[PDB]
Amino acid sequence: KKEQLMDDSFIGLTGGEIFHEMMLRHKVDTVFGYAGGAILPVFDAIYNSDKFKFVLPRHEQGAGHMAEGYARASGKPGVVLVTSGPGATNVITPMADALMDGVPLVVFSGQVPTTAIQEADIVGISRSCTKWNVMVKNVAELPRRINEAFEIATTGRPGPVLVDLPKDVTASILRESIPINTTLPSNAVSEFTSEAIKRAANILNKAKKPIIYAGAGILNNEQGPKLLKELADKANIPVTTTLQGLGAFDQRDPKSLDMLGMHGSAAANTAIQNADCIIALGARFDDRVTGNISKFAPEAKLAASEGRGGILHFEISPKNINKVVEATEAIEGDVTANLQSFIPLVDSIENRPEWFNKINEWKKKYPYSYQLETPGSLIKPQTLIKEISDQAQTYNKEVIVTTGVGQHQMWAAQHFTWTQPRTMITSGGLGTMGYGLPAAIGAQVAKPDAIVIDIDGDASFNMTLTELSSAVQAGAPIKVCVLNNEEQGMVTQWQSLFYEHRYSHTHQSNPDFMKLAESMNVKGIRITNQQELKSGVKEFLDATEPVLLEVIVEKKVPVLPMVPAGKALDDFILWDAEVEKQQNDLRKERTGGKY
Amino acid sequence: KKEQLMDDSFIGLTGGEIFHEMMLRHKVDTVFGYAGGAILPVFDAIYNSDKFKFVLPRHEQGAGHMAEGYARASGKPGVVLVTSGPGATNVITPMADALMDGVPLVVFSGQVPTTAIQEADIVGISRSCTKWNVMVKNVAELPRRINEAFEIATTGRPGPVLVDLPKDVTASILRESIPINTTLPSNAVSEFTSEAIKRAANILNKAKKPIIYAGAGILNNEQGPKLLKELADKANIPVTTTLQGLGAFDQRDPKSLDMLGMHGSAAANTAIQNADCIIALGARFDDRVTGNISKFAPEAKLAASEGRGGILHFEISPKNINKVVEATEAIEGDVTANLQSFIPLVDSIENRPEWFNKINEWKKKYPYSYQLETPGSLIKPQTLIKEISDQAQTYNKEVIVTTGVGQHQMWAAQHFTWTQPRTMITSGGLGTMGYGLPAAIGAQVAKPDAIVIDIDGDASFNMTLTELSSAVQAGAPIKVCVLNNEEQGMVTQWQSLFYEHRYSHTHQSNPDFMKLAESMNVKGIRITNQQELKSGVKEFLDATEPVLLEVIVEKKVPVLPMVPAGKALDDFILWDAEVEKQQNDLRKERTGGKY
Amino acid sequence: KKEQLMDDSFIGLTGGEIFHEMMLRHKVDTVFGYAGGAILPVFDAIYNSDKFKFVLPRHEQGAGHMAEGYARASGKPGVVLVTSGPGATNVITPMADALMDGVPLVVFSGQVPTTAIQEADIVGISRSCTKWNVMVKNVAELPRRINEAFEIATTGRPGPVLVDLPKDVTASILRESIPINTTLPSNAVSEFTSEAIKRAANILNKAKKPIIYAGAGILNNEQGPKLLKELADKANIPVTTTLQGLGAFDQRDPKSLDMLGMHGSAAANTAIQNADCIIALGARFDDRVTGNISKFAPEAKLAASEGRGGILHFEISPKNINKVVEATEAIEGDVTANLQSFIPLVDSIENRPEWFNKINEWKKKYPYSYQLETPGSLIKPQTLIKEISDQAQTYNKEVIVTTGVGQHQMWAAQHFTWTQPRTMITSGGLGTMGYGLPAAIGAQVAKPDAIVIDIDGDASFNMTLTELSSAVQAGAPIKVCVLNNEEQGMVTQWQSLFYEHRYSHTHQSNPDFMKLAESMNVKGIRITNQQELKSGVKEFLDATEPVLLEVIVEKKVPVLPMVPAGKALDDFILWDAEVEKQQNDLRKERTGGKY
Ligand SMILES: Cc1cc2nc3c(=O)[nH]c(=O)nc-3n(C[C@H](O)[C@H](O)[C@H](O)COP(=O)(O)OP(=O)(O)OC[C@H]3O[C@@H](n4cnc5c(N)ncnc54)[C@H](O)[C@@H]3O)c2cc1C
Ligand SMILES: Cc1cc2nc3c(=O)[nH]c(=O)nc-3n(C[C@H](O)[C@H](O)[C@H](O)COP(=O)(O)OP(=O)(O)OC[C@H]3O[C@@H](n4cnc5c(N)ncnc54)[C@H](O)[C@@H]3O)c2cc1C
Ligand SMILES: Cc1cc2nc3c(=O)[nH]c(=O)nc-3n(C[C@H](O)[C@H](O)[C@H](O)COP(=O)(O)OP(=O)(O)OC[C@H]3O[C@@H](n4cnc5c(N)ncnc54)[C@H](O)[C@@H]3O)c2cc1C
Ligand SMILES: Cc1ncc(C[n+]2csc(CCOP(=O)(O)OP(=O)(O)O)c2C)c(N)n1
Ligand SMILES: Cc1ncc(C[n+]2csc(CCOP(=O)(O)OP(=O)(O)O)c2C)c(N)n1
Ligand SMILES: Cc1ncc(C[n+]2csc(CCOP(=O)(O)OP(=O)(O)O)c2C)c(N)n1
Ligand SMILES: [K+]
Ligand SMILES: [K+]
Ligand SMILES: [K+]
Ligand SMILES: [Mg+2]
């Protein structure tokens, strides 16, 4: 019987051949990587493999971000395959990115032989960037480490893992017989949680001003958005989402409060500050969401002390519970599965007249107002976003949006109308510039029949623009739109606000994006005035090839609403036409009329 | 002028000679250490030094705990001097102990020469046990590292530091001229804190049911207990303290609520649970104090949501603020100095009739009740503590108490009457058995004219009893009282409670303590019955030599009150005579009449 | 078939019950531990377990050292079971000890619940002290971690491992079905190594002055000493061993060169310095063995450059190959197994006249000479060792010797006649004082029918003398002999040599060992003069109970031969009667006649 527990079907294969086989057993159809010395045995095994698609970037950071985009768009883990030394260190930022945003990234880096330990302590470096890392020391434990890597990466709160593959290990041939449970990937509710759910249902049934605060967690299950709506409809609760949760709830729905937070809807911020019961569904209360944490959720905290409300937190990661604010009730585990047990204990309520009246008043009082175009003025960036949003919806394909980091990121978050889950792929936790373009490529590979749009800033785009050639070589018809304000808008907004318009080294020079696109063998479109906006965007979206659209937008335009650091979530700056006018004069006189 | 900034007075001295000189400049009068190879150059320099007293233990752990006792009794940092390898690793527990209890410990460990790095990564190991560690790489930077070590150890929240001294560095001779600021030890309130104080004073002036929660922090300043009383008298506020804060407030005072927490006064626990304003003075809200954290301070949290009270936290370490419970107002910095700015903004209140009425009712309802002796029964451990407390007070010397860890520790904390600061020296954070005896020696060295009493358990005593000979060789007339219940009472209390009286390996065999004392050249006293209690304790306290008193006390006696894990702070077990009787039968029938 | 790969026989059991079951499956018959809060669920499971013997120390360091002694005496891994906090930190020194000496130690420490992470980063601290540590996060992965712990601890170069067991994990009940390969412990030669062996055999067959340098590695296989002798007899090669390899080769054999190194035989040191081929069998070339590394093995290095000899290194740990000296040929893997492939390729040589002539001349010229007793003088420590060695051999039981650290350790190593493997249990790598007594207890438990003798120093004994009561409670009739020279001889030897007889704090006061033994309920014997030596030792060895023998030995006696630090291995200090006389006068005049 001790022969039925051990498998011998891998005897004779090399490390790389076993790697290839384990990828197949984990249903891996895509690999993003860059060749090198230490990782050659693994590359020589995936050589002309018809079993999965390989995507070659120009830079390993590109590979990492592509795999992130793939992972967020498909729900599968994104596999990266880099070499030793610089190949491995170039994936640190994508790994740190994946960690902050809960992205299932599995990174295999080549390594110098075990007899030598382009050398770097990649395990030591990436320890603060990964859920878990390891070095495979011999070929026999390779399938075991691969299995562990994928599972750790995809369970609990998803995140990056690094598996170090020494050249001699992947080059060696397996001769032993390995345990059969290591050749195969895998493959109840505690009474503490079950009673916590019902105790939480009782608190919701007492609430007269409830609100749902939903995030990325509800997207890690395909039934998530379905049950989120079912709960919102049964108990009649308004729904707000984080930046990472955009698309979890149909924003066209009347109960939608849009995005909350630092640059979220002022109606959403006001609602959560006055709510007596907050239902957190897969969100970790980031400081860019809560604002001043002490002053956050006053009515919810007050209701908790009086046993008539509080904060109901549905988390899968214990480290995220009671970290920022005290959870009145903490329902641990997958939010979607727990919602199946939570909803049927919730009282079906039909009308909340007084509460929804305050909300609709707030929604009317707090739109995403901004200064509209004037005759002869540049295209306002907010208008560009709305234009792209409205035209993209009129296609019978699903639309996936990736962004860079800066003002364009927030405007995209604000003025797009989000309706489908996993359609907002953006670097929110770490906030990595140059994320947009490669993330779009990876998304396009995951979803070939989708329209993938990269709403990017010029500065962000300049960081990784070399990956345009990667998009062509991969056959990914991504649609890149660069909001060219010829500035690092986000930083200059801070300098215009807290540093008396002293723009210190925040204006990089941009290349000719049209000649750049031409050199990358990519379609180029440049919109310069208002009259070309509509016809320009249409040509942009109608393209069947990769296309780079450059739009000249207004400079020195603040993103509003804005909750300043230290201020309460409902203590926000609103857009005012007179104020913006006055800021434009103050900027002109201080800078000498140069900005 | 570049010659006035550099000192040359250390040129010609060895590392050890410089070490000796820097000790003098830091006003170090005592060093606890054990010799070894790597540390010989430092020992050969302190050879027959008349400038400070050296204390030699039998074990390095002994040295560490002695230095802790010295540090807690005197307020000076405790200097340890061990060798490399096992000498260094044996100080890990005292270092971890010092960290949890905020004890200024400066540990110098010898090390193999720089040309070799009994070898151990003592810096790597002790990183999680120290505020800061370092390895001196050359003799010229030795005075600089020594200065840094002492300052880091004694500022902010005090704690242990380790300085690694390679043998070649301490053996080498300084030839360079070192910066004169490194040969000398060293040597405003932010507007954010100043306004936070006044905002905190406004909250206190609104309170009708206030309470002071004082801890070890108020003892790190000689004006602490003075200002603690001044605040308690002006605003008329009851005072409770932690285990580590015992002696900060005169317990004979009517406003004293005694100790709070897991085994604290049930009146103190009830008071804090109903208080609308909690003033935390140098306490970090340990889980053994708060009980169930969610259910902690309900009336204080409720008052905060209504802007009529809350928690006023005076912390010096930012890492301890908003870690456990949300501070309504956080006054950072030294609590004593901040009290000088806080008190004069507090309204002088004379009478709190309704509040103090509830308190005095609670104090009367919740004494430290326990089963008294019966004819022919063993001495109850609570009686032994009271007897020692009452007799020691009748001496014209100050009394310092150290303890081990277990039931005797809590009984000592409960039934002693605490009146003076730095008179309760006990391992509270880490809870190290065998702490008592060596800590007492170190305290006796710091305070030669003091009566130092070690209330120890038999199990705890058995851990480090070899240090008795160290006490004699040091000339420390410590008074050790062993509560011999022939069991690990604390663990057996848990087994009697949560494991159906299944006493699994919790009864170690004790040696003849009288023959043990005789072998250590120490006076031995053994009390066996009630009639010998009074005359026994008197002989114990009247001794002018080191003395070991063994008292046979009742076995299987629970420590009450007790707040069980998970339960609220006011949800405690009280002592009941009928319940204890019934537990004694249930124990006899289950164990078969063996316990 | 997916049901045949998963086991359900652990469903319903608690963590502790599963722990108990896994211990049985790993053939664990002994556990050394100390109770505590966090580890109670594991203790409540081993409660009255008839399946293995529990040994309770007085201190956790005791437990660690006992488990080391058990592990070295039996060849089984030594299992330690401590609690959280101070219980865990007290095992750091035994763990560091086990690492340096290659001792299979498996340490299970209790831990605060997963919902809380007496708290300490025991995993972080012990990372530099263990081959591998881990924290079990849920009960389902507990058997998997236990299996991994034992295997890592016992394969390659054996060493310590720490498994952190959170209280809630060991208290929780398994409900899932775990992979069947995790419920069961487990359960070819590379062409690179195989050809390296034959290349090594060719080098030996060319040698005219070969030598075998054998160490602890040859003891990690029961066929080791057998094949070591077979190789030494076939090719006719003299054999020297390290301190840790004593007993691997019968010292009564003519080919025995005794121990080499800092305090080894001057004949052994001379032989290795002139040998043209050095066969290293399971030794790591410690600096206390090689002396000055550059000047080490001149004739071997010269022979290597001329292709007629060199160093043949049989290592199992790659990290130990080419670390100290360059291996001419490196045969990786278990030395015993590789010897089975190496020996039959070695030419059977019968006589080495010229080589063995030089050796026998060296052996005659370099005995362990020392100053013999004179009328009325104290017993010389060397004589005491020989006396114990000669009398113990006349028993029909096997003799196991443990020691402390210091002069007594080296004298024991020198003057005992070693004949059987695993009979020298001593702290060599880390050199931990207080190792002797608890290591002897653990050895006595492993080998109940053996005479276990602890040759201990007074200072070393004073460190852990409380464990005497542990020996009685365990029923371990250990035989402890304290060489009472009333000094830390080893350190004072260094001070007498390099510091002009300045004995800085190297004389601790000893207790009455006879009254100490009496208090511990242990038989006491005290030898004071030469005439009581023979009859004293006989009573000591004839005892059937635990016995503490105190022998008053000569003070300020150097251990010779001695290779000073920095000097070559054959540049040693020899014993000279005139020199010792002169040193005794120089000591008397400098110290003032006090030493
Ligand atoms: C310039 C800039 C401005 C920004 N401003 C805003 C803003 O105004 N508003 C805003 O919302 N964000 C803003 N952010 C982004 C913000 O920093 C965070 O990235 C984002 O708010 C986090 O969203 P999230 O908590 O929903 O997702 P995550 O950060 O990924 O957290 C999801 C949580 O759900 C848990 N979880 C995961 N899976 C499950 C599961 N299956 N079941 C249950 N729980 C699960 C996870 O453990 C995690 O704690 C900004 C970022 C940048 C760069
Ligand atoms: C078996 C056992 C049972 C126990 N049960 C109890 C119990 O029932 N009740 C109880 O109280 N304890 C109990 N403890 C002890 C408990 O675990 C802690 O050790 C203790 O409660 C902490 O007291 P503390 O916060 O006042 O001191 P500390 O732990 O030393 O914390 C002092 C705080 O004040 C801050 N501080 C330091 N210096 C200054 C300064 N100059 N100015 C301002 N702030 C400063 C520090 O940063 C720190 O945060 C028990 C321990 C054991 C072993
Ligand atoms: C005061 C003092 C003085 C000392 N003086 C001396 C002295 O004079 N002479 C002396 O010899 N020692 C002396 N030492 C001890 C010395 O420091 C080392 O402890 C000892 O020399 C190491 O012996 P070892 O290499 O044989 O064993 P180890 O240190 O345990 O090394 C064994 C080596 O064999 C390898 N190995 C293990 N298992 C196997 C296997 N199955 N197959 C193949 N390889 C394996 C291991 O990886 C390891 O590298 C002294 C110690 C002290 C405290
Ligand atoms: C790698 C990196 N560098 C710097 C930053 C800081 N940063 C955040 S937004 C921003 C400006 C981005 O400018 P742009 O891409 O053009 O976006 P815009 O604000 O103009 O729309 C910068 C520099 C960052 N988030 N990441
Ligand atoms: C080094 C160490 N080991 C174990 C523990 C767990 N522990 C806490 S109290 C206690 C029993 C102490 O018995 P004793 O010293 O006799 O005190 P008693 O309860 O009998 O008064 C133990 C084992 C600890 N705190 N420290
Ligand atoms: C824990 C520890 N502290 C210090 C040392 C340094 N040291 C090595 S040998 C020795 C003296 C031991 O004296 P003793 O036990 O009496 O042995 P002796 O030399 O007298 O035979 C010391 C202090 C050590 N090895 N371990
Ligand atoms: K929107
Ligand atoms: K009291
Ligand atoms: K010998
Ligand atoms: Mg820009």
Ligand SMILES: [Mg+2]
């Ligand atoms: Mg006891």
Ligand SMILES: [Mg+2]
């Ligand atoms: Mg000695």
